Ligand SMILES: Nc1nc2c(ncn2[C@@H]2O[C@@H]3COP(=O)(O)O[C@H]4[C@@H](O)[C@H](n5cnc6c(N)ncnc65)O[C@@H]4COP(=O)(O)O[C@H]3[C@H]2O)c(=O)[nH]1
């Protein structure tokens with residue numbers, strides 16, 4: 001199904017790049033900020049919307065009040081985080097893509113959370129793969 | 144495999160950038176608004192991919208052409224490289240994911256297949272919509 | 287029937303646009319907002335020549351006030367640091383009567399399309415997340 | 429389904445604008461009105477997301493000024509002068525959404541577009557207050 005490719009791409013690029021860069025630098029760009037310990041949480045909506053996950057992302061922002069910061073590059077990676085420990089979290093925008101694929105592929109909702117749980121499984125497998133993400137990371141489904 | 148990733152890339156990057164440019168006609172080029180009279184995004188696709196991904200080709204092309212990087216009008220910024228009539232060019236980093244999947248999944252022929260499939264689906268989705276049609280093109284068979 | 291198309295159009299355009307815009311901006315015309323709850327108001331029955339008289343009567347009886355969306359697509363809608371209690375009567379329902387005049391009971395039929403419109407609105411509110419509790423509908427009013 | 433949507437658009441927008449312009453001859457300061465006709469132009473094919481993109485493209489290419497009618501409003505697009513009204517009916521977008529929830533796809537959209545245009549021009553011709561002072565232009569871009 002066309003959910004493993006999205007999971008592979010999102011994990012590899014975003015997660016591996018950000019994790020390696022921040023482990024090699026230990027700092028973020030809020031003005032500059034510095035970090036002490038790392039926890040990245042992937043947030044997965046229970047079901048997708050008809051027109052992407054932008055509205056869900058904005059609702060989550062207003063509900064939790066996350067804060068903006070890219071990686072300290074002198075390839076900016078703007079992310080949302082909550083001498084200091086940082087509890088990073090994000091809702092992968094790539095999930096939006098899936099809905100469009102479905103239009104080119106109530107069975108709709110049933111299929112949708114099938115690919116959502118498959119995406120979560122692929123992410124967990126890729127966490128298991130590498131060591132840079134071997135406990136400094138977690139995922140949350142049915143949100 | 145490449146089709147869903149291609150759909151996602153097209154949707155997000157192309158529709159967002161085209162819509163913002165059309166509705167604003169202003170890009171923060173070194174933090175200063177430029178005019179917009181005629182433009183089009185040239186998405187250029189490598190013929191072959193490296194074992195490590197696409198970063199090397201992106202670096203080589205950008206250095207050869209020295210394309211300046213800037214975002215779109217803000218008030219999430221979508222940085223892009225380009226050169227008044229703006230000349231937008233794009234190396235889609237998403238292509239890297241392809242090999243990753245094939246690495247987890249004649250090889251070089253398979254990457255060729257995925258690259259050409261990406262090209263065709265991009266061209267089809269560009270042909271459909273009116274926001275992009277005319278203001279975007281895909282340049283395969285490049286280097 | 288020709289009530290699901292009207293319901294879909296009304297919901298999508300008006301409700302989704304306004305709700306998303308106010309969630310993303312939190313301001314109207316100046317005034318600033320803290321929370322949202324939009325009440326779609328549905329007449330218990332339709333009239334011969336639309337719902338203009340019903341809308342004016344409701345406005346006088348509740349004394350609503352004007353407000354548009356902070357666009358920099360003016361959306362003139364009626365509302366009652368400050369929590370706003372929004373309500374609205376969809377003018378599109380007027381159109382429905384003409385449809386019947388070009389489709390042909392009348393009272394029961396109109397009640398049927400009104401109920402179908404309400405069901406479609408509730409379904410679409412259930413669909414999206416931007417409108418997942420920030421919206422309510424009110425059928426059989428007065 | 430699309431027919432009722434077209435009928436509603438016609439009634440509300442066209443009837444109200446025609447009535448106001450004929451009874452006032454003043455639109456947004458106040459401009460005079462001597463002769464006019466609103467050109468409802470219908471896209472040949474629709475985007476997946478709706479009509480906003482085509483509306484923006486057409487308006488920017490033609491640089492159409494936007495203004496409302498007299499008050500004591502209804503916005504619209506146009507260009508001692510004869511008014512030349514124009515409008516992209518946003519309601520067209522609804523069609524695709526309905527057709528997406530309803531269930532060749534492009535051909536179904538073509539059906540809806542032709543039906544919308546036909547019913548629009550029919551209800552324009554039928555009434556007297558609108559006859560002559562309005563036209564629908566398909567086969568656009
Ligand atoms: N919160 C966050 N997520 C990111 C960031 N960078 C990538 N991601 C996520 O990783 C997915 C895949 O990354 P990609 O680089 O391999 O493919 C991306 C990339 O090739 C291109 N793209 C998207 N946003 C871009 C951007 N801002 N700049 C340049 N290219 C961009 O479009 C592809 C798909 O975008 P998507 O937004 O739907 O999913 C992203 C996206 O959800 C990031 O800096 N922050």
Ligand SMILES: Nc1nc2c(ncn2[C@@H]2O[C@@H]3COP(=O)(O)O[C@H]4[C@@H](O)[C@H](n5cnc6c(N)ncnc65)O[C@@H]4COP(=O)(O)O[C@H]3[C@H]2O)c(=O)[nH]1
Pocket residue numbers: 295296299300360361362363364374376377378379381436437440441502503504515516517518519522
């Ligand atoms: N309170 C409020 N309600 C609105 C507004 N815009 C639309 N609505 C509601 O959503 C229905 C359908 O929205 P639409 O945009 O898809 O189709 C509308 C719209 O596309 C068109 N129209 C009206 N005034 C227009 C205008 N000034 N410019 C362009 N199109 C216009 O007339 C269609 C039918 O109008 P209607 O009033 O009977 O039903 C509205 C109406 O009940 C609005 O700005 N405010």
